[PDB]
Design a protein around this ligand. Structure first.
Ligand SMILES: [K+]
Ligand SMILES: [K+]
Ligand SMILES: [K+]
Ligand SMILES: [K+]
Ligand SMILES: [K+]
Ligand SMILES: [K+]
Lengths: 95, 95, 95, 95
């Protein structure tokens, strides 16, 4: 399960890297803002402080969302159940 | 399962087409912006760079969301599990 | 199952009514905008074209979200599986 | 199950407290606005009336979202099924 976590973890980083590079290049964001934006998009928060301005950015965002949501939310699920939950349970007992 | 994917795929395209046509017509968006907006609405991202301005657009958006979320997120589920997951698994093995 | 649908349906309408009344009264929105806003909040779209300006509105929105999301998304689930899915299946066959 | 509810309830309050303190301190929000913002972020509504302006706030928000969504939505699930549902069922019968 550490290896089920590791795979989704890696694939999430790669996905966020892809968005950082595209939005920094095509939409002209600073790298930190492109990552932030990629995260705010794929978790569906969508503040809108940043949003794509070019048609190439709009089209990319459509595809990035559909390809990216299932991965991101899979990782969050694995994180919650296989990492966060056990550590919570361990805290309720003194060794 | 390719035919379970195909049905949801088609129904998603039809749903996004419906929104593209309405928002381009009633809210005056360019077709590309209406599609983008329809996608950003039904995936619940909701940047708000675009939002309906007319009461007819507001009422439509209410119904489009309720009718459209269950479909869109069904497709994303099918996509993740029946397409993305297997291809990931295939990459971890050399033929 | 029509009666499992009917209950969630009614409870959803009541929930959206509650929000329409509060936001129209305390935040000064037109009734149509308060409903629209209530729907955009509880489905987690959150365009932000409307957002509460008063501390009383902010506090209410916190509680409305936590109480309201589980209901709204339950209805959408019931809608998709017990209404939308069967009708889709019926269309694929001529009577 | 009251103790399964109580744990997630407490962990949710602690999580929202953490965000209130950070955003009030680093991003300069009033405490009430920082709580409101933390809630609007972790439920994925994301109005964007508030959004982090500093790089330290942006980085924190990335991590807060990934750590916080699984908890928040777990609580909402427990709330809906173990608290809201039973009380609904009890109302349909006179004692
Ligand atoms: K969701
Ligand atoms: K959102
Ligand atoms: K927004
Ligand atoms: K906005
Ligand atoms: K949003
Ligand atoms: K959302």
């Amino acid at each position: 399960k550490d290896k089920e976590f590791q795979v989704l973890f890696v694939l999430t980083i790669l996905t966020l890297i892809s968005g950082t590079i595209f939005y920094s290049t095509v939409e002209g964001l600073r790298p930190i803002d492109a990552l932030y934006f990629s995260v705010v998009t794929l978790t569906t928060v969508g503040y809108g402080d940043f949003s794509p301005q070019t048609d190439f950015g709009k089209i990319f965002t459509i595809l990035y969302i559909f390809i990216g949501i299932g991965l991101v939310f899979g990782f969050i699920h694995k994180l919650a159940v296989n990492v966060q939950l056990p550590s919570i349970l361990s805290n309720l007992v003194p060794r």
